Swiss-Prot record, chain C:
This is Spike glycoprotein E1. It comes from Western equine encephalitis virus (WEEV). Signal peptide: none annotated. Disulfide bonds join C63-C75. N-glycosylated. It comes from the Viruses. Glycans are attached at N49, N74. Class II viral fusion protein. Fusion activity is inactive as long as E1 is bound to E2 in mature virion. After virus attachment to target cell receptor PCDH10 and endocytosis, acidification of the endosome induce dissociation of E1/E2 heterodimer and concomitant trimerization of the E1 subunits. This E1 trimer is fusion active, and promotes release of viral nucleocapsid in cytoplasm after endosome and viral membrane fusion. Efficient fusion requires the presence of cholesterol and sphingolipid in the target membrane. The lineage of its organism: Viruses, Riboviria, Orthornavirae, Kitrinoviricota, Alsuviricetes. It is a single-pass type I membrane protein. Interacts with spike glycoprotein E2. The precursor of protein E3/E2 and E1 form a heterodimer shortly after synthesis. Processing of the precursor of protein E3/E2 into E2 and E3 results in a heterodimer of the spike glycoproteins E2 and E1. Spike at virion surface are constituted of three E2-E1 heterodimers. After target cell attachment and endocytosis, E1 change conformation to form homotrimers. Interacts with 6K protein. It is found in: Virion membrane; Host cell membrane.
Curated annotation (Swiss-Prot), chain E:
The chain holds residues 847 to 944 of 1236 of the full protein. This is Spike glycoprotein E1. N-glycosylated. Class II viral fusion protein. Fusion activity is inactive as long as E1 is bound to E2 in mature virion. After virus attachment to target cell receptor PCDH10 and endocytosis, acidification of the endosome induce dissociation of E1/E2 heterodimer and concomitant trimerization of the E1 subunits. This E1 trimer is fusion active, and promotes release of viral nucleocapsid in cytoplasm after endosome and viral membrane fusion. Efficient fusion requires the presence of cholesterol and sphingolipid in the target membrane. Interacts with spike glycoprotein E2. The precursor of protein E3/E2 and E1 form a heterodimer shortly after synthesis. Processing of the precursor of protein E3/E2 into E2 and E3 results in a heterodimer of the spike glycoproteins E2 and E1. Spike at virion surface are constituted of three E2-E1 heterodimers. After target cell attachment and endocytosis, E1 change conformation to form homotrimers. Interacts with 6K protein. It is a single-pass type I membrane protein. Residues 35-52 are annotated as: E1 fusion peptide loop. It is found in: Virion membrane; Host cell membrane.
Amino acid sequence: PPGDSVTVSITSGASENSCTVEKKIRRKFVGREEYLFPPVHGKLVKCHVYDH
Amino acid sequence: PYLGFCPYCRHSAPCFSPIKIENVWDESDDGSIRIQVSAQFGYNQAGTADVTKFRYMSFDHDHDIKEDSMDKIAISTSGPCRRLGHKGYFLLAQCPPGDSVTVSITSGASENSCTVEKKIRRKFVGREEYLFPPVHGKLVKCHVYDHLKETSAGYITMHRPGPHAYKSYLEEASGEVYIKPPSGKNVTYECKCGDYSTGIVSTRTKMNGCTKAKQCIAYKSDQTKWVFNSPDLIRHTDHSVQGKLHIPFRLTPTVCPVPLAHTPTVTKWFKGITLHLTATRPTLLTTRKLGLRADATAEWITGT
Amino acid sequence: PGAFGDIQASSLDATDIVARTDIRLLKPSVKNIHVPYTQAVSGYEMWKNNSGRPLQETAPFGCKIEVEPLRASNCAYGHIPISIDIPDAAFVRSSES
Amino acid sequence: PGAFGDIQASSLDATDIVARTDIRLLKPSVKNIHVPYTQAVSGYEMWK
Amino acid sequence: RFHTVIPSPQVKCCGSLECKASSKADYTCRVFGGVYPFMWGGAQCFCDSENTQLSEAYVEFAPDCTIDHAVALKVHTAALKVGLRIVYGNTTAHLDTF
């Protein structure tokens, strides 16, 4: 989700080790209209996404 | 206990879920919100009343009614919400500010969640902003959703379920089509491989003249159910009014406490006054003359 | 559409509801079943946001507005000519006063 | 009240602390025991 | 607030449909060509084409309008009524007059 920093943590039992780094993660959209989620109905436009 | 087509499932893309949110209402002044979903709560497989557990439709080709417990329900907009009530299709929960509302069932690792956009803002009653109802203050008239689950805000119409075809019921072999009804259940089938042909079968049944699986359909005569007039379902041929559920949690009037601002300090002068004002939160000030012209002035004031 | 009174009825329970909300249906594109539609925002909410202050805080002459029934109490303006037939019993003649 | 020096003293530990912060008590209304009051914001914070 | 109620769509599975003329509030009905819709089992019809769909929608009053609603009125000439206390000599009198 949107956030000002990103944190990665490991919880080995009671031993918790977490590293945090500042990174302004913002909500971005493709097209010309803002939207929280990709709607069921709408145009299909070109986009670029990290391959899973 | 039907399933809707949720726009936002657990992973991301739209998908069919038993817990689709159809409508959300937030007209109460205390921040409580009433939510409508497809699943049935307060009931077991037979529909008998019970607060400990709810029902829904299974994720399988039989799509029978499966069951789960209250502790596995989670409601959240930006943080976890407090469940105030549940009845039938409806929930009532107090939630924090957020842009969307999500309802999820945590069956072990299966965290099936449906999210719908809804700008839920923090609203208040009166002329003074606050986060919580103050301990001391005036008692004004407000309207809040009743937490009683047997109330009635209106009604929702339901109709008999329509056909819901399955491909698992159909089988392709050697370029020929077969129908495999579930054991002990009569299944109405219909196909068109030339002449249009309907019928009902109850066993492993051949069909002739058909080469592709797409050309036939089959479904069990499930007249033993009722479904809300949702836009995510295919309706029956006779879509007459065949039921009316109540809408619980009526919006009743009551008395709400609102704060009283710091008393102003009035300094007089020739044909005029000066009000020194202190209000940590936005407080409304409305002045008007008592002559021919009101000269009404309204302002929300913060600080000092 | 998009303004106050876009949906009207004689009463809450009246079944002859008439409205013009500019609702329009679009072609379904995605494979899964659904009925898309775009509709203008509720004009009732638009008026509510831009309602302004009520008449209780703007009426002139210091007149207190009230409802059920609609009325304006303690409204100070003008002069009332009054003709009154005060009884002669209360009067006391000057010969005794 | 509401301005700098709305609380004054000769020292931090001095007992001759003099205050004029415009604090007024209000009549209690709820059944439970509690004393309500209102008071001007800290003028020191306003100056800060 | 109006509740935009959308009846469940119907499909004439391998035929045609025509929009009827109902008398609901802001009634809107349209007919679309072949759609071939999916519910959960990968298919609902057997004709890839000529598989029309009927999209239906209208509006009703929201369930919470019984409290949250606005009433529109027209006013006419207003009659002013007065409650009056009058004292003469020893006698006081209260009277309501037009």
